[PDB]
Design a protein around this ligand. Structure first.
Ligand SMILES: Nc1ncnc2c1ncn2[C@@H]1O[C@H](COP(=O)(O)OP(=O)(O)OP(=O)(O)O)[C@@H](O)[C@H]1O
Ligand SMILES: Nc1ncnc2c1ncn2[C@@H]1O[C@H](COP(=O)(O)OP(=O)(O)OP(=O)(O)O)[C@@H](O)[C@H]1O
Ligand SMILES: Nc1ncnc2c1ncn2[C@@H]1O[C@H](COP(=O)(O)OP(=O)(O)O)[C@@H](O)[C@H]1O
Ligand SMILES: [Mg+2]
Ligand SMILES: [Mg+2]
Lengths: 384, 394, 233, 889
């Protein structure tokens, strides 16, 4: 286990032949030395004799306690499950490295002495915020942007996959990325494509669910979000609809607007605190960009600012090609009449027409979609 | 030529490593056990020496003593209160009142005094570790550094120039300006160079859920700080911890003001903090309370303005000293193009223009690569700009 | 099994015997709320709405292959609307009943709260019970609901991979709900519930008079014409 | 499966070689013209390396293998033309015609006759034709011949020239990374007589290329970092003239034939020291090559530059001797006072601060042995011109209070304070020399050898410490006068004062602790000749240690000077010379392992390492030779610092499993000092594995054995976050881990890493990996700690000022003639390249960029830019001349 990290010839050289035949000697000499221990000092099996000596030391009732401090000369103050805490001693088979204050431990039943530590069963909010599998199709599903698709790879993907281009330039990659535009133009859609591609752990939270009902519970949730993001890996934090922290007021929140503010001051810390940050990228998305605090959008916390426009009439035709790809489209229809139906129909409007027109076919058990399906589709989707 | 011959002779000796290390004992991937060849000290001896003679010694808390006799009154978590006695192994000196002690389960007598409770959310905000920001990175604001550095470290590094002259030097200092000016950055340079305990506090960590809970964390901060000889408290974004007392009608924002009053009491009056030096840093100081802006608490009032011209030229030389550039570019032309720009924007200009070199092919930036980054960062992101409603601090 | 009772001796704390099956916390949650279990046989005059609600919920369970033949995405969210007392709840309860779904309704209470989690800083912790009873249905009554639904619809938009989870919101007065919820890709189908007319006030009386002791010769048609369309309640 | 149709090759070469016995006799034309049709068509269809599935090479020998066994042997009238059509066609598929017993019968087809000019049909093709087969020739066939029959028949004679052009063929076709395959050709051929293949490939390399030298150059030293002793003898002397004959880069001669100095011949590098003074063009390389010849890997060169051209080119020698050493004083004078360093930092004692409130009160520790450690609040922090005026009052008032060995210790502290000095180091001693005390003068005059360490000018060859020595009838005047001069003249090889100090060994005066460090004094001087020292040592060993069975004062001091007298040669002759010399009882045969492996510092000779374990592995040894098996493990502590990380992982994987885990006395008492010898680098693989057996003190043993592992786990230089591991143990070390014997020790641990901020390179690897000993000044202390009784009285001579070869820190220095440049530097994590694409990326941690005298660091390769071209020395060595040239617009 981690015996030798050197592989660098990568050929049929004598050096790769010599190095591993050196390691062949260090292994067998280690083997033949430790072989002579049980030959001259048998004295136990060592497979279970020292084990059953431990297993007869620690009792069959094994109470679970909780650390709260450590004094280094193998005794520490531990909390029982009731609340009455003790000052027991700590053993030597206890591998004194995984002991943090608050970690679950194993005590004795008689003298409550610290026998072992316990693996934590975590967590019912880490698994809430951690995206398990890749969501959907690739960047080829998007179509039409082609300018900001380059921009997001520039800040997130290319820093991860090619960490050579920045070093030869002697530079650090840009920190923050915000995505803004009219509603339904594909802000959330592009973040799915990043979650498709990347190898980093991907964390997602809506901006609406940052606000809480108890005092101080809001800023506590932000402090433990970036705790989780740092303690895994290179990671991506995606915050969606962050204008919703300020626009809507809810009566569940006990503090008024001056509790929203204290939540935003904690988030304003976590992006550009004085603590050593690490490898955590932040992606943010909104549609009301003029509402939120400009202290949060300054360079240093967010570097790249990406605007999404409404789809153009030659890029609209690309979108109809995408969402009507795998459907049995009857040749009655002409897509160009559907393009300029609304002068400013979003990309979300196109998928809303294409799905609803398919639902009109299943009312009549058909398999192909005719023209009058789309004729009564836009009456149903758009005009109400 | 010997393609398999190096390979299978590699593979079996990589296996023969594992095939005998399983015969030594590192295996049985545990649920909380040790390396098996490491616990042999307590294998036979201290298994029956740290366990069978040694006892549990349940820990308690002392109410008071009384005259003429030991007769100590003790207290535990939920159970009753007893009248106890010492052991022989400890003197009656360090069994002072209000002190946690360990106590046996049968006779209920005192074994050893204990360190007090630290309330572990205050334990995490000790920094323990230093950042890498040097004062060489805080260029452009030299006079602001010097007026700061004579308050924080020169009474600590030389406590004789002030004593023999006969002056008690100032104790507190706040740092205020527009955002992205270098306030939090300059505080990192202080923690780099110093030697005392550097206890940082972010003001959005004192808002608690119960009533009066936040005011106790202010005490436990200054309790452990008075134990230390010299200590340096850092307060960041204190417009959360208290603006002003303005109570009208329904009492709103009443709870945060009690935390702000407890902080004022720990800074002045009645056998003071002694050798504790505080350091606040706000973003808009017009909201702050007049009793907190009083000297004796916040003596120095360092301003972080925007750099003039030579402040800006020095910042370009910091954030672009370590990047592959054309030799013949001039920075003085660039600083004339950014009239009211923070130090945070000048870094983002330099990091953006390197990306233009990575856009096409090349390996070093040019002068026009900077100019393509200036109009994008300064004049195209100018809709946001973050500054002009913060110069007036509203 | 994890989360299963046992017997246990006391001198040595040795395992003795498996003690059966206590409750699911999802079962105790619905046992608190006590929804009025319904069926199609107690639906009075809603024949066209039953056809609409089956195309969105009933079909993409029994035949998920039938949309791959059309190559469109299967729908997820249904909005029901109309005046109160016109049978929004009983229709949603019936559809979950007739295709074997775990009908979960959330109201944002706090007696409910101890079965979801200890604090539940999100609402999204509800899904752990919901993806364990995999063909489930989330239901929401009549602005805390309108923020609750936006948090669910963002999860089941591509980020959630476990299928056969659908949400149903019932409210009146659709012109005042949120514009973010009125984005055209968001809600798959909206269904209006009118107050019943003369032909539909009759059969609600007919189904409800099943359990009364009647006298021969009544002419319920004259009775239903006396009520000028109040509601089905 | 689409078979058939286009089967021309499985049919017509299935027909015509089958009709070749039907067309050899009574058909004279078809025996050749179809064979010529079989020679060219098999040649043409084989040259492209894109169709490796040839239509004949795996198709014709289903019957053609049984044909050729009746075609070549069974014809018996082979002519001069029909053998150039047979053996050029039948020797091509034979690595794939035959299975794995091909190796005995490559010659039943080829050595009939080699057809003409065999590379004529091996031109376009790289290795499918016969270059794989040519590797098969030197693998097994030449090895059975060239084992004891090298001078032989055709199997060697043409085989030299057959390996001539084929080794040229690797640097012929493409000039790919197959150039490094030629060291796989030259070395497998005649492994021990490598020079007979290298002389055929040295002159061919001289006419090969001047750009395709450098990657094969590093390929050889990659093979020369470890080898068999005769291979390491041969391939390193073949390594030398390629920067002389082919290239004239010629500046890596001095530091990298210190590689070749001790094993091959000590005159050979002196014949290469002659090669220095021949290529006298002009000054820039000439300055920098001999920069290292004074105080970087050896001294003893200051007698070979007083030739008849003493103007400036041979007046470099005195400027080599002490003036660039004074520029290394000018390091600490101008450059280190500007960065951080005040005259008294003093405050690591102030960093021992907060234990007065950690658990009650303080003012409790009143141990007098703490004041021994309080000498190093002065002594450790004041290196590199940390001069003190009335700041030695902690050393002044403890000089006149108690602790006679501390009167030695406070006076010996002044040598470390004025280090690398000649200017006023003698003048500072005399204001505290005059006290008329055995302990004050002998500690101060021992520190006089510390100050001029590396100066070796006229300070006292027989002046000050000889006058100290001749005062002797008594204590440390007899003792503390021979330690300083053997320290100051450790880099010297002067014979005279070694014979001034030879009757110290030959006095037979029964002051034993004087005689113990006497061998430790003279062993520091010479590592080669004067066998009469080895006579003088062993005679008093037979006169004293034979007629007694007592303490390690004999064993830790007396044989240790012998291993220094024969350090660094893997010849295994010095093992014959010294181990047969003191054939004796096993407690005098303690020194069986001393001179054996002190000659075996860094190489690969793992056949020594198995006989370093298997003779005395455990044997359960009821209190007999436990000092020997600790010392047998002490000689396992070298051979691991320089295989260049190859045994460093392989030593940490063993000892944590072997000795401290499952041993009895070797592990629990002693086996941690490997980590005090393997590295002062600092990495958490071993830095976290040692306090597992330290914070668990294991108080049942002689607990200062684990506290011996306390202070010398803080042995690592280059200060780190390791104050956490020590002060927390220093917190529990107040009450427990008693201050009655360890209050000196826990702070000696603590004050050790931050000696100053700088000046930490004491870890025996220069340039990239060469020795710079170094070892002679350090190895006495690690032998000295075995175990007890010298923490109070005797080891205070050693535990202060043992290792003093601190060749200080940095590589940021310009040394252009005016000294006005700074640099254009860029420090990085160490390089990873062995053979990669061209250009090869050196290293990967570009995020640091400096220009001036800044630090060295643990794995650092530092390069530059700006088209300064850095043309001086290119390898490393921290005093580049830094010339410049700008012919690139
Ligand atoms: N340019 C586009 N290309 C392809 N599909 C699109 C595009 N724009 C919108 N869509 C479709 O619209 C749906 C919704 O897009 P998305 O929610 O990402 O827009 P949005 O701006 O994030 O919405 P909101 O503003 O409500 O957050 C997606 O499922 C996607 O299929
Ligand atoms: N004078 C300066 N020289 C170099 N860099 C600077 C300077 N001023 C600011 N910066 C840059 O600004 C960033 C830190 O800004 P800082 O956090 O101090 O802003 P601030 O003044 O604290 O306002 P806020 O409280 O909103 O963060 C760093 O990336 C730093 O590079
Ligand atoms: N169409 C209907 N047929 C039968 N019963 C109905 C109908 N509409 C309402 N009810 C009665 O109304 C009650 C259910 O309330 P409901 O109308 O579902 O609430 P909501 O106002 O949310 O729709 C049931 O007790 C049921 O008897
Ligand atoms: Mg969206
Ligand atoms: Mg800040």
């Amino acid at each position: 286990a981690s015996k030798l990290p050197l592989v660098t010839p990568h050929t049929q050289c004598r050096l790769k032949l010599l190095k591993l035949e050196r390691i062949k000697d260090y292994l067998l000499m280690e083997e033949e030395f430790i072989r002579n221990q049980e030959q001259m000092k048998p004295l136990e099996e060592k497979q279970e004799e020292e084990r059953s000596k431990v297993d007869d030391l620690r009792g069959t009732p094994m109470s679970v306690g909780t650390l709260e401090e450590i004094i280094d000369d193998n005794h520490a103050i531990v909390s029982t499950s009731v609340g009455s805490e003790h000052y027991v001693s700590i053993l030597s088979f206890v591998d004194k490295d995984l002991l943090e204050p608050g970690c679950s431990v194993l005590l004795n039943h008689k003298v409550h002495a610290v026998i072992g530590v316990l693996m934590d069963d975590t967590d019912p909010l880490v698994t809430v915020m951690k995206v398990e599998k890749a969501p959907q199709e690739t960047y080829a599903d998007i179509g039409g942007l082609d300018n900001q698709i380059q921009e997001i790879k520039e800040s997130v993907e290319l820093p991860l996959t090619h960490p050579e281009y920045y070093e030869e330039m002697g530079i650090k990659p840009p920190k923050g990325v915000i995505l803004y535009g009219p509603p339904g133009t594909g802000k959330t859609l592009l973040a799915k494509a990043v979650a498709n591609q990347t190898s980093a752990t991907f964390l997602r939270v809506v901006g609406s669910e940052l606000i809480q009902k108890y005092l101080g519970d809001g800023p506590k949730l932000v402090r433990e979000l970036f705790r989780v993001a740092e303690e895994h890996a290179p990671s991506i934090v995606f915050i969606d609809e962050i204008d919703a922290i300020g626009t809507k007021r809810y009566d569940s929140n006990s503090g008024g607007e001056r509790e929203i503010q204290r939540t935003m001051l904690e988030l304003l810390n976590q992006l550009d605190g004085f603590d050593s940050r690490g490898d955590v990228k932040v992606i943010m998305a909104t549609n009301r960009i003029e509402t939120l605090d400009p202290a949060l959008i300054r360079p240093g916390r967010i570097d790249r600012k990406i605007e999404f426009p409404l789809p153009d009439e030659k890029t609209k035709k690309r979108i109809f090609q995408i969402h009507t790809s795998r459907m049995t489209l009857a040749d009655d229809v002409t897509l160009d009449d559907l393009i300029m139906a609304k002068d400013d129909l979003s990309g979300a409007d196109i998928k809303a027409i294409c799905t609803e027109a398919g639902l009109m076919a299943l009312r009549e058990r058909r398999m192909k979609v005719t023209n009058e399906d789309f004729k009564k589709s836009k009456e149903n989707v758009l005009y109400k | 030529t010997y393609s398999r011959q190096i390979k299978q002779v590699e593979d079996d000796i990589q296996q023969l490593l594992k095939k005998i290390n399983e015969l030594t004992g590192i295996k049985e991937s545990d649920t909380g056990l040790a390396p098996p060849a490491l616990w042999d000290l307590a294998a036979d001896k201290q298994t029956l020496q740290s366990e069978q003679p040694l006892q549990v010694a349940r820990c308690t808390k002392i109410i008071n003593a009384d005259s003429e006799d030991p007769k100590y009154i003790i207290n535990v978590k939920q159970f009753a209160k007893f009248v106890v006695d010492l052991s022989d192994q400890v003197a009656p000196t360090d069994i002072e009142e209000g002190m946690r002690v360990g106590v046996d389960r049968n006779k209920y007598q005192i074994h050893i005094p204990l360190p007090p409770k630290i309330d572990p959310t205050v334990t995490m905000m000790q920094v323990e570790e230093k950042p890498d920001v040097t004062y060489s990175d805080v260029g452009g604001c030299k006079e602001q550094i010097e007026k700061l550095r004579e308050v924080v470290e020169t009474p600590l590094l030389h406590p004789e120039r002030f004593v023999n002259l006969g002056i008690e030097p100032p104790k507190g200092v706040l740092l205020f300006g527009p955002p992205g000016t270098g306030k939090t950055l300059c505080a990192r340079a202080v923690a780099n160079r110093t030697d005392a305990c550097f206890i940082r506090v972010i003001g959005s960590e004192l808002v608690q859920k119960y009533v009066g809970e936040g005011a106790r964390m202010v005490r436990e901060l200054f309790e452990m700080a008075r134990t230390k000889k010299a200590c340096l408290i850092f307060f960041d974004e204190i417009d959360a911890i208290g603006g002003a007392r303005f109570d009208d009608g329904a009492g709103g924002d009443n709870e945060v003001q009690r935390t702000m009053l407890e902080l004022i009491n720990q800074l002045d009056g009645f056998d003071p903090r002694g050798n504790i030096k505080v350091l606040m840093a706000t973003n808009r100081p017009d909201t702050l309370d007049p009793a907190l802006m009083r000297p004796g608490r916040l003596d120095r009032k360092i301003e972080f303005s925007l750099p003039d011209l030579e402040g800006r030229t020095h910042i370009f030389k910091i954030h672009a000293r370590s990047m592959s550039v054309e030799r013949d570019i001039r920075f003085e032309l660039l600083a004339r193009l950014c009239p009211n720009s923070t130090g945070a924007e000048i870094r983002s200009v330099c990091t953006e223009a390197g990306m233009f070199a990575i856009r096409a092919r090349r390996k070093i930036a040019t002068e026009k690569d900077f100019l393509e980054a200036v109009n994008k960062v300064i004049k195209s992101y100018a809709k946001f700009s973050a500054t002009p409603r913060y110069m007036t601090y509203n | 099994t994890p989360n299963c009772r046992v017997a246990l001796r006391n001198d040595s704390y040795t395992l003795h015997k498996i003690l059966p099956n206590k409750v699911d916390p999802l079962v105790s949650l619905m046992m608190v709320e006590k929804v009025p279990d319904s069926t199609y046989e107690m639906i009075g005059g809603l024949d066209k709405q039953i056809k609409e609600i089956k195309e969105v919920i009933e079909l993409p369970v029994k035949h998920p292959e039938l949309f791959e033949a059309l190559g469109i995405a299967q729908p997820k969210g249904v909005l029901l609307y109309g005046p109160p007392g016109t049978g929004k709840t009983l229709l949603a309860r019936a559809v979950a009943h007739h295709t074997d779904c775990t009908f979960i309704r959330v109201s944002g209470s706090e007696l409910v709260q101890k079965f979801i989690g200890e604090g539940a800083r999100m609402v999204r912790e509800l899904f752990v019970m919901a993806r364990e009873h995999a063909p489930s249905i989330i239901f929401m009554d009549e602005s805390e609901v309108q923020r609750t639904m936006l948090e669910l619809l963002n999860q089941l938009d591509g980020f959630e991979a476990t299928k056969n989870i659908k949400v149903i919101m019932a409210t009146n007065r659709i012109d005042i709900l949120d514009s973010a919820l009125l984005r055209p890709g968001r809600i798959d189908r909206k269904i209006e519930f009118p107050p019943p007319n003369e032909e539909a006030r009759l059969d609600i009386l007919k189904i409800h008079s099943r359990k009364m002791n009647l006298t021969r010769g009544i002419n319920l048609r004259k009775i239903a014409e006396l009520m000028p369309g109040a509601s089905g309640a | 499966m689409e078979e058939g149709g286009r089967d021309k090759a499985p049919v017509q070469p299935q027909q015509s070689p089958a009709a070749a016995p039907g067309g050899t006799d009574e058909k004279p034309s078809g025996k050749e013209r179809r064979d010529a049709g079989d020679k060219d068509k098999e040649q043409e269809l084989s040259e492209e390396d894109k169709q490796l599935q040839d239509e004949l090479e795996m198709l014709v020998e289903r019957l053609g293998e049984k044909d050729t066994s009746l075609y070549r042997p069974a014809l018996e009238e082979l002519r001069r033309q029909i053998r150039s059509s047979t053996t050029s066609m039948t020797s091509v598929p034979k690595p794939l015609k035959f299975l794995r017993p091909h190796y005995g019968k490559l010659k039943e087809i080829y050595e009939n006759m080699a057809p003409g000019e065999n590379k004529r049909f091996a031109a376009d093709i790289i290795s499918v034709l016969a270059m794989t087969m040519s590797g098969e020739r030197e693998c097994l066939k030449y090895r059975l011949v060239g084992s004891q029959e090298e001078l032989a028949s055709w199997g060697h004679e043409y085989v030299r020239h057959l390996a001539g052009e084929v080794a040229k063929e690797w640097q012929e076709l493409d000039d790919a990374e197959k150039v490094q395959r030629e060291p796989l050709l030259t070395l497998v051929k005649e492994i021990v007589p490598y020079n007979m293949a290298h002389n055929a490939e040295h002159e061919a390399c001289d006419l090969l290329m001047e750009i395709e030298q450098v990657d094969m150059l590093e390929k050889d030293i990659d093979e020369n970092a470890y080898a068999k002793v005769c291979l390491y003898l041969t391939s390193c002397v073949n390594y030398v003239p390629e920067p002389e004959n082919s290239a004239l880069l010629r500046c890596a001669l001095g530091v990298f034939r210190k590689f070749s100095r001790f094993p091959e011949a000590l005159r050979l590098a002196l014949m290469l020291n002659d090669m220095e003074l021949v290529e006298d063009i002009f000054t820039s390389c000439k300055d920098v090559v001999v920069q290292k010849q004074m105080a970087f890997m050896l001294g003893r060169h200051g007698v070979f530059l007083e030739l008849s051209e003493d103007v400036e080119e041979y007046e470099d020698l005195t400027e080599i001797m002490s003036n660039v050493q004074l520029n290394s004083n000018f390091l600490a004078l101008a450059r280190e006072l500007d960065i951080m360093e005040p005259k008294v930092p003093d405050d690591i004692y102030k960093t021992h601060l907060e234990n007065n409130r950690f658990g009650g009160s303080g003012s409790q520790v009143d141990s007098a042995r703490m004041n021994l450690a309080s000498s190093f609040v002065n002594g450790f922090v004041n290196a590199a011109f940390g001069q003190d005026k009335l700041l030695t009052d902690d050393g002044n008032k403890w000089l006149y209070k108690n602790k006679d060995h501390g009167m030695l210790s406070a006076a010996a502290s002044l040598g470390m304070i004025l280090l690398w000095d000649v200017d006023g180091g003698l003048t500072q001693i005399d204001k505290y020399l005059y006290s008329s005390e055995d302990y004050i003068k002998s500690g101060a005059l021992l520190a006089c050898g510390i100050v001029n360490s590396g100066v070796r000018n006229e300070c006292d060859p027989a002046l000050a410490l000889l006058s100290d020595y001749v005062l002797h009838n008594s204590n440390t005047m007899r003792l503390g006068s021979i330690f300083g001069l053997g320290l100051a003249y450790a880099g010297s090889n002067r014979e005279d004062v070694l014979t001034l100090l030879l009757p110290v060994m030959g006095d037979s005066k029964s002051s034993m602790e004087v005689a113990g460090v006497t061998a430790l004094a003279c062993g520091m001087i010479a590592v080669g000749s004067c066998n009469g020292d080895v006579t003088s040592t062993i005679l008093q060993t037979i006169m004293e240690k034979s007629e007694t069975e007592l303490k390690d004062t004999y064993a830790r001091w007396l044989p240790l000077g012998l291993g220094l007298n024969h350090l660094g040669k893997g010849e295994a002759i010095e093992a014959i010379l010294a181990a047969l010399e003191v054939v004796s009882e096993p407690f005098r045969s303690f020194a069986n392992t001393l001179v054996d492996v002190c000659a075996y510092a860094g190489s690969g000779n793992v056949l020594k390492v198995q006989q370093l374990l298997h003779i005395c592995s455990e044997h359960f040894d009821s209190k007999e030779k436990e000092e020997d098996k600790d010392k047998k493990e002490k000689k396992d502590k070298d051979k691991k610092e320089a295989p260049a990380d190859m045994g460093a992982h392989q030593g940490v994987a063993v000892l944590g499993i072997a000795l401290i885990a499952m041993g009895e006395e070797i592990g629990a008492e002693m086996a941690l000092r490997t980590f005090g010898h393997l590295l002062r680098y600092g990495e958490p693989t071993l830095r976290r594995a040692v306090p597992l057996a330290l914070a668990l003190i294991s108080v049942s043993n002689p607990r200062l054995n684990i506290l011996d592992t306390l202070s010398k786990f803080s042995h690592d230089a280059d200060p780190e976050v390791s104050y956490n591991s020590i002060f927390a143990m220093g917190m529990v070390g107040s009450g427990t881990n008693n201050a009655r014997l360890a209050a000196m020790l826990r702070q000696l641990a603590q004050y050790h890493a931050k000696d100053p901020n700088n000046l930490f390179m004491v870890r025996l690897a220069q340039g990239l990996t060469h020795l710079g000993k170094g070892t002679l000044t350090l190895c006495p202390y690690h032998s000295d700690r075995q175990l007890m009784s010298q923490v109070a009285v005797a080891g205070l001579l050693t535990v202060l000022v043992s290792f003093l070869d601190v060749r200080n820190i940095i590589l940021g220095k310009s040394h252009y003639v005016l000294y006005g440049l700074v640099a254009a530097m860029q420090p990085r994590m160490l390089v990873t390249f062995d053979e990669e694409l061209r250009p090869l990326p050196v290293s990967v941690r570009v995020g640091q960029a400096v220009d001036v005298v800044g630090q060295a660091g643990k794995p650092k390769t530092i390069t530059g830019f700006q088209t300064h071209t850095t043309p001086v020395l290119l390898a490393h060595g921290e005093r580049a001349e830094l010339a410049t040239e700008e012919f690139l617009p």
